[PDB]
Amino acid sequence: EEAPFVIVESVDPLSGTCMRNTVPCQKRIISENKTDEEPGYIKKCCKGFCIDILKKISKSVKFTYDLYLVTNGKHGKKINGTWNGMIGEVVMKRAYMAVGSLTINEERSEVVDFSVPFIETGISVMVSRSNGTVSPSAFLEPFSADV
Amino acid sequence: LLWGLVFNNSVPVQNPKGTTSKIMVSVWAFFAVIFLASYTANLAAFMIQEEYVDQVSGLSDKKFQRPNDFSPPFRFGTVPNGSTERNIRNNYAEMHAYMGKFNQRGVDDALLSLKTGKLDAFIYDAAVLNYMAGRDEGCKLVTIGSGKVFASTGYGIAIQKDSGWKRQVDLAILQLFGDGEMEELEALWLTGICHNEKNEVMSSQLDIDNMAGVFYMLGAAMALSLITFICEHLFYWQ
Amino acid sequence: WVMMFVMLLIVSAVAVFVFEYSFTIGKAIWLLWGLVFNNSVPVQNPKGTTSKIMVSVWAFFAVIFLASYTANLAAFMIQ
Amino acid sequence: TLDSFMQPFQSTLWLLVGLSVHVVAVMLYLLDRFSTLSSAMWFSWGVLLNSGIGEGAPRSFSARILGMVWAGFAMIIVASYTANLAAFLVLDRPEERITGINDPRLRNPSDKFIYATVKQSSVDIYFRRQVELSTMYRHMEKHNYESAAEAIQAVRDNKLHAFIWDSAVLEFEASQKCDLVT
Amino acid sequence: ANLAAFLVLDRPEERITGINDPRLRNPSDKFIYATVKQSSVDIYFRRQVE
Amino acid sequence: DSRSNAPATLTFENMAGVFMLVAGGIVAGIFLIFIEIAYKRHK
Amino acid sequence: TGELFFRSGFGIGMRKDSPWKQQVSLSILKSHENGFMEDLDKTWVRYQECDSRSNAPATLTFENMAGVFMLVAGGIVAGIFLIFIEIAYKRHK
Amino acid sequence: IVTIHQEPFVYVKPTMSDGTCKEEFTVNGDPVKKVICTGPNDTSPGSPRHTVPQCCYGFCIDLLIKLARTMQFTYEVHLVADGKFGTQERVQNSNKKEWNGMMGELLSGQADMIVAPLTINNERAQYIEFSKPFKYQGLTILVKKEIPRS
Ligand SMILES: *[C@@H]1O[C@H](CO)[C@@H](O[C@@H]2O[C@H](CO)[C@@H](O)[C@H](O)[C@H]2NC(C)=O)[C@H](O)[C@H]1NC(C)=O
Ligand SMILES: CN[C@]1(c2ccccc2Cl)CCCCC1=O
Ligand SMILES: *[C@@H]1O[C@H](CO)[C@@H](O)[C@H](O)[C@H]1NC(C)=O
Ligand SMILES: N[C@@H](CCC(=O)O)C(=O)O
């Protein structure tokens, strides 16, 4: 889950499921550390832009899918010579794919294969707008230097 | 007489006794009145609609390159464990250590801190920042410039290496652009309320930072006045 | 406007008995009235310090008001 | 309307402006003797106020160059004041008005925007049948009211942000009490 | 004042909104627009029937 | 029928902030008469 | 005028099953992050000399001067004639 | 390599008499690299076209030189025959269809790369392979500005 690309919702309390225009996805939870819990999950469903893109791709080219949320480590970061996160999942089999917010860069594109980008992104600076304007020489702004 | 009369009739002066002299000053006064009125308006028009300028350029500025060498130190932060931090580390080694104390936790916490005043600038992905700035309670936050990205990349689908599905996935993705569903999806999911078309904040009270020019010209006039007086007095001393 | 006129009369009388301690009544009214309207009309200024101090603030009042009015009247054209 | 004096200028500017008038008056006296204190004080302070009082003038060539430029600074202050007051009386703070049914606020409901209609009406039929507005119906059915007259009272008390109903009824309601708008 | 009113206000004369403008969707004989032959712009317009 | 722009004919509201200063000088001018007449007799 | 409706990007066209497929793609991605790509934009694409802004409120120029300065000048060349009238009328009555 | 005349990206200028064209410096005195191009003159190809050497400089080929620096491979650029980006047509009323433009030379062994502005779409992606884009853009409309108010 990240941005307006993937939004994770909660299950409707009545029917134990959730409505249309949404894909059910199951997020794993770990409770006990002394004795780890085997196949203990919770059920949710999530929607967003990438979900719609995946739905259209699956409708176009025929295949079946089953989303499941990441376990730990956000997107991905090479930590002491071992990946973790979404990239760590896909590079260690048992994932085979990955969707959502994941930029393309040289270091990350040497262990996986990327598709054609469907949006333009980058690095931007965000500041709070000041309740003022600029006018250092507004008095001399009108007229011309020759008159 | 003429210089006082042109600038809206202030200083006292003795008028000429002659009749043709009285005639000429009349048309000169008409010209002066026309002149002045126009100038005032013009100034109203310039002031009424003036575009604002953000007080920062980009990632190559004195504010960023030299943080402490400024008036009240400039504070900014970045959420770690991401692509932006890795990109910043390689190309700007000096300014990476300065933001260690200002590492945030999440986007919501960073936005809250920016609203309160703990931070002054935020560095993160442009696509999400545009959405977050375009959908806010009020119009306090801006995206800098017109959205001049620095490291242009794009979001993609990660697939396992050496697999046949890559070509079909790429063709299916490329198909959507041609038929135009991408436009509909972007309009449905990424549009916001604001548009950032450089609207008039309707500035107020004309702080001292504006008329610094006119007081500088007055001071320069004073300097030349006493310089000329000293020179003339010493010349007349002989 | 009408309260401005009546206060102009009041201030004229004020200047009258301030000068009491060739400027008695009509000339002074004419001068003050002239002073509001961009100082167009030639006048005969008094020669008392207290009278000058009294006239200065009226001057101020005149300058502020004229400015308001032009600006305010410009709004009708723009809306 | 405005703060007659306080709106166009800061409080800090006036003291600087008032002090600056006193600065030159001291200087004008200096040039006269080097090559009338009250008379010189009247001149510079009088010019900025546009009032005509006083007969003293700088006879020496020293203050003639300085006196002329001082008159220019008098008009620039007043001229800027007039333009600023015009700018404040014309512009307005930006605001967002719902453009219609395709506005982003309604299409993707948040947790702080509430709108509803009258239960068991023709509006409920319109939204239920269409599929593209399925995400909009769920938010509406939780806050729907019982009657049109009761629902309008809720908008006044800030328990509801928007109300969807026929334009014929609502257009009449806006005129009677113009603290609402369509 | 009148002078200020004349200065400030002006008419943009409806300088084309974009691809959904009514001037382009159903064209008359008083508006002409064209592109370069055998380009990617031709592929975009020809491929879809709308 | 005020629509939304609604140009405002300014009322007495602005007059309070301006007429007080000029009216205040009247009661502040009579006080300085006493020092003026005293200074003439003193010097 | 207007916004953008068909969004894509320029690319380096190569034939399929080419040995240069892998190396070229990595080189382009490296050029973006190290700042070399934006240097080209400043040199060849980014320099503006024409005025920005749509309305572009422009100050008055001499064209206004000719309409007003000539009027007062015309009085000067016409005022000299009137002086002769006054002095002639001075001795004529 | 095969390129195309495009004003912002690929400039085309005639060479000097001796065979090496002019030396040029930027605003800050930075030398501008130039590559010899062998393209046909007489931009309208109706008249018999004769190849004539020229020299090019601009955005695309400056990127080409640095790209060729790391891979250590030489190059020799020429210009497309008829100045068409390329579309797929039908010829001689037959059952076989072929490309017409700079895409034909790439397919028919007369070229190996296209360092030129060539957008990515579904039609061209089934025959050639595209690299990651080095510049994002879109389509827009150009119209004449109105007259200012006197
Ligand atoms: C960024 O990654 C580092 C990895 O070193 C995270 O540090 C760990 O965070 C977890 C969760 O709080 C702790 O249990 C570990 O003990 C931390 N490791 C160390 C060595 O301190 C860090 O929390 C991550 N930060 C964010 C914002 O995701
Ligand atoms: C020409 N004198 C003016 C003026 C002079 C002095 C003070 C205020 C003003 Cl408003 C100049 C600007 C508008 C018209 C006007 O009355
Ligand atoms: C780093 O390298 C390997 C795992 O990649 C491991 O043997 C080693 O202990 C790691 N170091 C630390 C400090 O975890
Ligand atoms: N979108 C980034 C993570 C967020 C960031 O680094 O700003 C990535 O793909 O790594």
Q: Cα–Cα–Cα angle for B35, B38, B40, nearest 5°?
A: 110
- Asked whether the CA dihedral B104, B105, B111, B113 is positive or negative, the reply is negative
DSSP D84-126: HHHHHTT---------STT-HHHHS--SS--EE-BSSSHHHHH
**HSE of B13, CA atoms in CB hemisphere, 13 A:** 16
Extract long-range pairs of A140-145: CB within 8 Å, 24+ residues apart: A140/B213, A141/B43, A141/B46, A141/G59, A142/B39, A142/B42, A142/B43, A142/B46, A142/G59, A142/G60, A143/B39, A143/B42, A143/G59, A143/G60, A144/G59, A144/G60, A144/G61, A144/G62
Please report which helix (H) or strand (E) contains residue G9, including its range: strand G7-10
Query: What angle, 0 to 180 degrees and rounded to 10, lies between the N-to-C axes of helices G21-33 and H59-71?
Result: 120
Q: Where are the beta strands (DSSP E) in chain B?
A: 122-125, 141-142, 153-154, 158-159
Determine the residue among C72, C73, C78 to mutate to test chain E binding: the one whose Cβ has the most chain E Cβ atoms within 10 Å.
C78
- Do the Cβ atoms of H85 and E40 come closer than 8 Å? yes
Task: Specify the amino acid at residue G65.
Answer: M
Report the run of H or E that residue H89 belongs to, with start and end: strand H87-90
Contact D90 B48 (CB under 8 A): yes
Q: What is the resolution of this structure in A?
A: 3.7
- Give me the residues paired with residue B54 across strands: none
Which of C10, C11, C72 lies nearest to residue F10, judging by beta carbons?
C72
Distance of CA G28 to the CA centre of its chain: 34
B81 lines ligand 1 (CB under 6 A): yes
- Distance (Å) from CA A124 to ligand 1 centroid: 25
Which tokens belong to B47? Answer: 């002031």
Instruction: Give the integer Cα–Cα distance in Å for B205 and D80.
Output: 11
User: Which letter does DSSP use for residue B58 in this model?
Assistant: -
Cα G22 from Cα G24, distance rounded (Å): 6
Residue A80 Cα: closest atom of ligand 3? 1
For residue A137, CA distances in Å to A141, B206, B214 come to 6, 12, 8
C-alpha dihedral, D165 to D169 to D175 to D181, nearest 10°: 10
Which uninterrupted H or E stretch holds A8?
strand A7-9
Residue B168: closest CA among chain H residues belongs to which residue? H126
Helix pair angle (G36-44, H59-71), 10° resolution? 150
Chain G contact present for H107, CB below 8 A? yes
How far is G15 from D173, CA to CA, in rounded Å? Answer: 70
Distance B86 CA to ligand 4 centre (A): 10
Q: Answer whether A77's CB lies under 8 Å from B81's CB.
A: yes
How far apart CA B203 and CA D7 sit, in angstroms, is: 11
Residue H140 burial (CB count, 10 A): 13
The beta-strand segments (E) located in chain D are 115-116, 162-163
Measured CA to CA, the distance from residue F4 to residue D181 in angstroms comes to 10
Tokens of A38: 């085997």
DSSP count for chain B of H helices, then E strands? 9, 4
In DSSP notation, A130-144 reads PS----TTTTTSSS-
Tokens of C61: 């009042």
Query: Which residues of chain A make contact with B126, given a CB cutoff of 8 A?
Result: 121-124
In chain C, the largest separation of any two C-alpha atoms, in whole Å, equals 52
Q: State which H helix or E strand residue F41 sits in.
A: helix F13-42
Question: φ and ψ at C18, to 5 degrees?
Answer: -70, -45
| Radius of gyration from C-alpha coordinates of chain H | 18
- Which residues on A lie below 8 Å from G33 (Cβ)? 105-106
Instruction: Name the nearest CA neighbour of A127 among B150, B117, B70, B149.
Output: B117
What kind of experiment solved this structure? cryo-EM
**Contact between A60 and B175 (Cβ < 8 Å):** yes
A42 three-class SS: strand
Tell me if E4 sits within 8 A of C77, measured CB to CB.
yes
Name the residue of chain D whose CA is nearest to C76's CA: D90
Interface residue A103 vs chain H (CB under 8 A): no
Distance (Å, whole) CA A100 – CA A47 = 11
Cα(H105)–Cα(H84) distance, integer angstroms: 11
Query: Quick one: closest CA in H to A120, which residue?
Result: H136
Q: Which residue has the tokens 């020496």?
A: D60
Beta strand H97-100 with H87-90 is antiparallel
How close does chain E come to H84, measured CA to CA in Å?
A: 6
Nearest to H5 by CA among H84, H109, H64, H66: H84
Number of residues assigned to chain E = 50
Binary contact (F33, C57; C-beta < 8 A): no
The per-residue b/e assignment along D77-91, b for 16 or more CB within 10 angstroms, e otherwise, is bbbbbbbbbbbbbbe
- List subunits contacting chain H, requiring 3 or more Cβ pairs under 8 Å: A, B, E, G
Q: Which residues contact H83 (CB under 8 A, 6 or more apart)?
A: H4, H5, H43, H45
**Type of residue at B110:** A
